[PDB]
Amino acid sequence: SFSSLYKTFFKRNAVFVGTIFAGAFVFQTVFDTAITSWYENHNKGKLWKDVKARIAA
Amino acid sequence: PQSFTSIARIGDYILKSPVLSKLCVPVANQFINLAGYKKLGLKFDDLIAEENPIMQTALRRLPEDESYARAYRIIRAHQTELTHHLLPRNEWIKAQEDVPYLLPYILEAEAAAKEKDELDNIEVSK
Amino acid sequence: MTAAEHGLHAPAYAWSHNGPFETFDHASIRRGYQVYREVCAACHSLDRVAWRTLVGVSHTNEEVRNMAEEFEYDDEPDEQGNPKKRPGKLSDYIPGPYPNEQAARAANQGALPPDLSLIVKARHGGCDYIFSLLTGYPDEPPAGVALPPGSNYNPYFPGGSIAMARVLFDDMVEYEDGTPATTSQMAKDVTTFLNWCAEPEHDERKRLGLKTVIILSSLYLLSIWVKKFKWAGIKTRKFVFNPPKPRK
Amino acid sequence: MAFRKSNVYLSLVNSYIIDSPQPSSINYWWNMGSLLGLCLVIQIVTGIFMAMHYSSNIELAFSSVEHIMRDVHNGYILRYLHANGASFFFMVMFMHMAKGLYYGSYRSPRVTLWNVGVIIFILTIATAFLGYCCVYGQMSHWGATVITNLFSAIPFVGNDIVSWLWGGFSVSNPTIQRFFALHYLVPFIIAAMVIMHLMALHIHGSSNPLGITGNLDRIPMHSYFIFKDLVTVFLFMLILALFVFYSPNTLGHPDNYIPGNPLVTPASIVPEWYLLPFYAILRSIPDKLLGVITMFAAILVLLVLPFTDRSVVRGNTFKVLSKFFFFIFVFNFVLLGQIGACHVEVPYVLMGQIATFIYFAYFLIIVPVISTIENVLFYIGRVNK
Amino acid sequence: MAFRKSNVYLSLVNSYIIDSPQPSSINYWWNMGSLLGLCLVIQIVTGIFMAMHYSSNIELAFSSVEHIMRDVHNGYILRYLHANGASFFFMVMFMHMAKGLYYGSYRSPRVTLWNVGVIIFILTIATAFLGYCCVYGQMSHWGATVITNLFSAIPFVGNDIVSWLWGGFSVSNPTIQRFFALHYLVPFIIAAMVIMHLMALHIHGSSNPLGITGNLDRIPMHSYFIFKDLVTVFLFMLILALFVFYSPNTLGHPDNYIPGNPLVTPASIVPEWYLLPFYAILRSIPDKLLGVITMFAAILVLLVLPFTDRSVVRGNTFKVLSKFFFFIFVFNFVLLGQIGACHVEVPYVLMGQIATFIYFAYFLIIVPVISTIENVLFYIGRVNK
Amino acid sequence: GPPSGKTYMGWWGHMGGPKQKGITSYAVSPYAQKPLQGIFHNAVFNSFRRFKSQFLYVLIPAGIYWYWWKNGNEYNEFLYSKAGREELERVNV
Amino acid sequence: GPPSGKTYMGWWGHMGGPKQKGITSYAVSPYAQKPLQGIFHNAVFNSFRRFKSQFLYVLIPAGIYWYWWKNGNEYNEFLYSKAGREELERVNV
Ligand code: HEM
Ligand code: HEM
Ligand code: HEM
Ligand code: HEM
Ligand SMILES: COc1c(O)c(C)c(C/C=C(\C)CC/C=C(\C)CC/C=C(\C)CC/C=C(/C)CC/C=C(\C)CCC=C(C)C)c(O)c1OC
């Protein structure tokens, strides 16, 4: 639905910068957590997180 | 930097001798063909650099039509190289029409410049 | 440039921690330190790592202390100026067993024992090279080769003469369970440990590198697109010549 | 009149950045040079942030670097970035010079630019050597001793000048303190020289890759070329990240990570990758004075490349023999570096000596004779009678 | 056309040293500005040759100063010249300021110049404090502690920023290391700002002492004013020699020569003489945030001087009341400094408060009302009806 | 500013190049152009033709020096392989 | 070159000052006259005239602040001189 509504949403430069900054914030957060999750579960038995659980008895 | 007086002398000496001409004309033709500038749309009367003041005097002597045509060819070459393509095989500069139009306007001024640089250091004579 | 003076070129072992997306197998650093402390003992130094960085990487919180109170560090004097020894704390380095330098050259029967804290980052190749040195000793000295007394042979050391023997035998560590009596195991543990101690920043470095490479790849492709975009206003302009009227 | 051309502090930036009529046919190498400058500035910034946490003694210099690489929040990134940014700086420096040689930029209009550039080159080599001495590793100390003893070749004043610059009979506290202070100072002089390079450049603009006059059409820097520099620097940043994270120790050697010890020397003493060509020619000619003079000769030859080439047609896009010889020259350079890195043995000495001969000959004699052949062939082929 | 005005590297120097039509009626104050420039350059040079032999660790910073004092051949001259040239530089900069304020150079056509200059002023104050910390004597440590803690007056989050700038919870290796590195960095930024200062100056010449148009006649730069600079710089050299040889420890205070000891502090801790004026107003008003803001407010109230001096007649060469008030203000300034130096007791709190009041009052309200009275008197005197 | 020397390039409006007439440059504007008009045909075909047209100029030098380096290396390790008394001493010494 | 903003001072020849006619200047060259003319007479006489002209502008402020400084010093001295139990307390607060 790329009608004139998005052009009017992009017309104001200040709201453009506000939106780009908010997107940067949310992107930073979600991208960082996703990358950490992928890096972590990719190594079962390697990282300290589960090693300390295993040594726990 | 190297004057065209020496180049013209060497060229006339090579061309006058018949056996050396038969030896060097075919290699010259094949060289200028592989040179890679006929296709993209350049006459050799433009490739010569334009920093020496003698070149400025040479261009200032050109008639209007040749200067305009040279401008068109050089800008078109700029654009075509920017595109990374080559021109279509219809406007490739044909071999028989690579006429020298600018060489005399270099030599005519080069002779004057040489004799100017010489005549200052004249002697009292006898 | 003979082969004897240069030593065997290092092989291409299939490491466990190698690879662009792999961390350490530091379920074994926990025992690599154990075997290192057992067998290296009072020979090599390792005097560049602080007991506040083996916590949360190989040891949980309190074991590091529970061995730190087994050393001495010679801290500030009392009211009478007599220097005092107190048990170690959590922010103090491991003591190199040989006091300053001289006992080292008095006990090794030879040259200085090189510092292990950065050794495997400071040799050609190196990730495998330490493994090759540790396992490369032939069980019988080579025949028909001169060798000075005391030093033992090496087909991997450049020059083929090492001042240290091969104390890497079997059934002499016994970490916690059934695993030792395989000298390859102790060699693997110690090399992983030393590769960690050369840079206690492997995991974080790899993660940050992955993040940066993803961000940069995306940014680079976007830049390609934008260059194709706003440069397209001139990469397609067309010129048409007209012969000007010949009048002057 | 627009404010972009009224305020002087901004009029300058306009004339050099916002609006400057670059030529239309520019290829990626000019952006390569701009990327080079930006590499310089990021190197300077991270160097300052490095030095804020660096000691300067000789018993407490290695400890400082291990401290900055291991025991400071987000530190090792700084140290690897400085090192590999320097290495990439030398890569791009050599690339910029090679472009200059190839496309006819060194010719008459910008001889001053060429001179300032080669001055920047020798300055940069000095800076890199100074910094490489600042670490005081194992081989770095030997390199410092060798270079500070190079000047002993000069007759009469051979022991006084070294005793002055070296500040002592042996490498000790004054030597390293002096080296570090100079290593800090001289990059700012490089920045001043960069400003001079820009001023000498803008007087006549850049050159066409075709070797043709660029006074016909032009397009401004910003909104056209700023994006090109942006894309090429994104490529550089990603490759530098690949090095600084995935494989850190590939553009160097694993000997700097060794405490300084003036008792033993490594099996092979080698400079960093960007000096091997200027090290092979030292083992080439076995006269001390000859080597010391021939290094600066290898630079002065770059100085004297102008008014040596005498083809009336600029550039080497349209001269097959000339460009083929240029390629054999660049492979000569890489072979020279490689033959330097390998040891001095029976075939290698002949290899290196022949390499030096053909290298200096290409600069001196190959270029003029080939140029004259090219000019005469062009003159005779297109003319008939 | 003359080679002096053709080559770019020399066409630049021509328009700034060889051909710059200064006004006819120059007096010694602009020669004094040239003196200031030369003081800066000698400070930079001797600083380089100082850091050539200076360590950086906290435990080996004082020992480094004694080492530069004696154990280096002809070195005490370097250290004393550095310190006393810095103090003389600050005095001459203050006199440059007072000149500028008196003669009305801050009139509108040079507001950019004046703003850039006051930026150099604040930068230079920062540099002086940084170096004085670099010494790390006894009271310099407390001065660093207080001035770092100054930022804790920031509302809400104030402890995090000070702990960040202060390298931890104690004055230790990162503190002095960063302070010294920044001190060694900043004067080059000063050099950049002063080349901007020259750029901004050249747009519209220099003001007449008469406060009137100087476009009528001017005399060439070189061979006339170069010697007016030479005489004053020779005076500077001789007075600096007098203060560096016969009377070394007068301008500074004899307290720096103590090892750092964060356990005992003397009851008499004062800044060096050129920071007393602001220290007085800081200790004057009885608040933390008020003082912290009012220092930079003194700088800002300096800033506000243009578009406030509403005299249609430039300068204070023909206004008896205005020049009398300027003299009361400069004597105010020196009184402020001296009372800051003296201890605070019963008869001094009121003295200092009144001093600050008249100071800021002169900046804000004294100039406009007095100027308006002068203008209206000038109109009324020479008009009939 | 003081007058400066003669220069072959100026600023906008006084480029100083030869005066031209009859040239008529066009444009299309970047928004209504669909940037990647040719993105696979142009890529593959132009890349391969350009690689073909400038192939020898790097093959010949690289091959020459690779052959040279291989010969040098093979002779070097032939020297230090059961030949240090008969072949080494006749050239090295 | 790139044109810049308007400036209130040109260079030689186009200096920008008001045009004038009839003004005549002179000179006698440095070598044809004694460098030190007046040296003492002008020194003493002009020095005293100048010092007389502006004496009060520096005399008055200095006197005022000297009077303040003297009064402050004397009161401070009196404060801590056998008066710390009968005058210091009643004014310190
Ligand atoms: C700090 C290092 C340097 C910087 C920052 C620098 C900067 C620049 C810049 C900005 C350009 C314009 C386009 C480009 O970016 O390439 C340029 C061009 C050029 N530089 Fe440099 N340069 C440096 C080093 C050198 C050196 C060492 C030389 C030569 C020895 C040199 C010679 C040239 C030449 C010949 C051009 C030609 C441009 C043309 O022909 O179109 N530069 N440089
Ligand atoms: C001007 C600011 C700079 C500072 C403060 C600085 C500081 C430093 C420091 C502290 C080191 C490491 C010291 C050591 O290892 O003991 C270093 C290394 C180095 N610097 Fe710089 N540097 C600066 C600029 C530059 C520049 C401009 C270059 C080159 C373009 C450069 C090239 C190097 C190199 C090659 C090393 C390698 C040695 C090592 O890896 O540490 N530096 N620098
Ligand atoms: C390193 C610092 C500085 C340098 C090198 C410098 C240099 C100069 C120079 C060369 C001049 C020309 C006349 C003269 O020499 O005095 C000048 C004039 C001037 N400077 Fe500075 N200056 C510096 C700092 C400042 C500061 C901090 C200010 C003001 C906040 C300032 C304000 C002025 C003014 C107002 C003039 C006016 C000249 C006129 O009106 O006749 N300067 N300066
Ligand atoms: C105009 C700018 C500068 C000023 C006003 C300045 C001022 C000072 C002052 C007041 C000190 C204290 C020294 C003392 O207590 O005796 C000092 C110390 C020092 N400055 Fe600077 N400085 C300046 C620029 C520089 C530069 C550019 C360098 C180095 C290149 C430098 C290096 C030093 C060093 C090494 C010390 C050591 C402390 C000492 O030994 O006492 N300074 N500076
Ligand atoms: C031992 O084995 C070797 C080896 O054989 C070789 C060749 C090299 C290669 C080394 C070199 C080629 C050395 C080159 C280094 C230099 C030439 C640097 C020499 C030092 C300087 C030139 C100091 C420069 C410092 C300055 C302050 C310059 C002075 C500045 C001036 C005059 C400008 C003044 C400023 C103004 C504004 C006027 C090695 O590194 C090496 O070790 C592995």
Q: What is the CA radius of gyration of chain B?
A: 18
C150 lies in the same domain as C187: yes
The number of beta carbons lying within 10 Å of the beta carbon of residue D65 is 19
Nearest to E124, CA basis, from E203, E209, E41, E183: E183
Closest residue in B to C247 (Cα) is: B64
d(CA A32, CA B79): 45
Please indicate whether, in this complex, the C-beta atoms of B65 and C246 are within 8 angstroms of each other: yes
Phi-psi region of C181 (alpha: psi -120 to 50; beta: other; left: phi over 0): left
Kind and range of the H or E run holding D219: strand D218-219
- Contacts for E328 with CB less than 8 Å, ≥ 6 apart: E362, G61, G64
Chain D, 248 to 307: residues with Cβ < 8 Å from chain B are: 307
> Helices marked H in chain D — which ranges?
8-13, 28-51, 62-70, 76-103, 111-134, 139-150, 160-165, 173-202, 225-241, 277-284, 288-304, 320-341, 346-361, 367-382
Amino acid letter at E270?
Answer: V
- Please name which ligand lies nearest the alpha carbon of D144: 5
Nearest-by-Cβ selection for F12 from D21, D204, D205:
D21
**Which H/E stretch holds residue E226?**
helix E225-241
Are residues C113 and C20 located together in one domain of the fold?
yes
The reply to whether residue A35 touches residue C23, judged by beta carbons under 8 angstroms, is no
Q: How far apart are CA C51 and CA D52, in angstroms?
A: 26
**Resolution of the experimentally solved model in angstroms:** 3.2
Find out whether D202 is annotated in a ligand binding site.
yes
Contact C98, C104 (CB under 8 A): yes
Is C172 annotated to bind ligand? no
Q: C72 pairs with which residues across the strands?
A: C87
Name the residue with tokens 């029409």.
B97
Residue D4 contacts F, CB cutoff 8 Å: no
The domain defined by E3-382 folds into: Cytochrome Bc1 Complex; Chain C (1.20.810)
- Give the tokens for residue D7: 């305020």
Of F9, F61, F75, the CB nearest to D327: F61
Residues 6+ apart with CB under 8 A from D383: B11, B15, B100
Q: Which residues pair with D22 in a beta bridge?
A: D219
D367 Cβ inside 6 Å of ligand 1: no
Q: What token pair was written down for E17?
A: 């040293």
Contact E63, E219 (CB under 8 A): no
Same domain flag for C63 and C149? yes
Q: CB F5 to CB E14 under 8 A?
A: no
Q: Which of D16, D35, D96, when mutated, tests ligand 1's pocket best, judged by the most ligand atoms within 8 Å of its CB?
A: D96
Task: Report which residue type is found at A9.
Answer: F
Chain D residue with minimum CA distance to B33: D381
> E22 forms bridges with which residues in the sheet?
E219
Is the beta carbon of E81 within 6 A of some atom in ligand 4?
A: no
Q: Tell me which residues of E are annotated as active site.
A: 202, 206, 228-229, 272
| Beta-carbon separation of B64 and C248 below 8 A | yes
Write C151-159 long-range contacts (CB < 8 A, 24+). C151/C110, C154/C7, C155/C7, C155/C8, C156/C7, C156/C8, C156/C129, C156/C132, C157/C7, C157/C133, C158/C5, C158/C6, C158/C7, C158/D267, C159/C4, C159/C5, C159/C7
Residue D197 Cβ < 6 Å to ligand 1: yes
- C40 is annotated as contributing to ligand binding: yes
Q: In chain G, how many domains are there?
A: 1
Distance CA D246, CA E331 (A): 66
d(CA D276, CA D279): 5
Q: How far C157 CA lies from chain F's nearest CA (Å)?
A: 19
Q: Number of B:D CB contacts under 8 A?
A: 102
CB-CB under 8 Å, D214 with F12: no
Query: Does ligand 4 lie within 6 Å of residue E179's CB atom?
Result: no
Please identify among residues 11-40 of chain B the ones whose CB lies closer than 8 Å to any CB of chain F: 36
Nearest Cα residue in chain D from F84: D346
Domain that holds residue C206: 201-248
Q: Which amino acid is at B3?
A: S
Give the number of residues written for chain F.
93
- C-alpha closest to that of D254 among C130, C32, C13: C130
Residue C39 near residue C180 (C-beta atoms within 8 A):
no
The answer to the question of whether C127 is labelled as a binding residue is: no
Q: Measured between beta carbons, which residues in chain B are less than 8 angstroms from residue C239?
A: 72, 75-76, 79
Of F15, F57, F65, the CB nearest to D215: F15
Determine contact, residues C163/C110, Cβ cutoff 8 Å.
Answer: yes
- Is there a contact between D250 and B86 (Cβ–Cβ < 8 Å)? no
- Ranges of each domain in chain E: 3-382
Q: State in Å: Cα E201 to ligand 3 middle.
A: 8
- Contact of D201 with chain F, judged by CB distance below 8 Å, is answered with no
Residues of E in contact with F2 (CB under 8 A): 5, 11, 14-15, 19
Cβ distance D323 to F57 less than 8 Å, yes or no, reads: yes
With beta carbons less than 8 A apart as the criterion, state whether B2 and D311 touch: yes
- Give catalytic residue positions of D: 202, 206, 228-229, 272
Same domain for C146 and C233: no
> Which residues face D218 on adjacent strands?
D23
> Domain coordinates of chain B in residue numbers?
1-126
CA pair distance C129, C111, nearest whole angstrom: 20
Q: In angstroms, what is the span from residue E88 Cα to ligand 3's centroid?
A: 16
Nearest CA in chain C to D343: C1
CA quadruple E37, E39, E45, E48: dihedral positive or negative? negative
Cα distances (Å, whole numbers) of residue C185 to C131, C139, D303: 11, 18, 60
- Does residue E346 contact residue E353 with C-beta atoms inside 8 Å? no
Q: Known binder of ligand: residue D197?
A: yes
Task: Indicate which ligand has the atom closest to the C-alpha of D142.
Answer: 5
Judged by its nearest atom, the ligand closest to the C-alpha of residue D139 is 5
Please answer yes or no on whether F23 and C236 come within 8 Å at the CB atom: no
Annotated ligand binding at E16? The verdict is: yes
Domain shared by C75 and C127, yes or no? yes
Instruction: Give the CA angle between residues D250, D256, D257 to the nearest 5°.
Output: 95
Report the structure determination method.
cryo-EM
Q: What is the least distance, in Å, from the CA of D302 to any CA of chain C?
A: 34
What is the C-alpha separation between D205 and D105, in angstroms, rounded? Answer: 11
In Å, what is the CA distance from B96 to each residue of B8, B43, C193, D373, D384? 21, 12, 77, 23, 10
**D4-13 long-range contacts, CB within 8 A, separation 24+:** D5/G2, D5/G3, D5/G4, D5/G5, D6/G4, D6/G5, D7/E112, D7/G5, D8/E199, D8/E200, D8/E203, D8/G4, D8/G5, D9/E112, D9/E196, D9/E199, D9/E200, D11/G2, D11/G4, D11/G5, D12/E199
Pick the residue whose CA is nearest to atom 34 on ligand 1: D100
Q: Which residues of F touch E8 (CB under 8 A)?
A: 4
Contact D83, D90 (CB under 8 A): no
SS3 of residue C55 by DSSP:
strand
Tokens of E40: 């800066």
What residues pair up with D313 in beta bridges, in sequence order? Answer: B48
Mutate to test the pocket of ligand 5, among D124, D129, D186 (most ligand atoms within 8 A of CB): D129
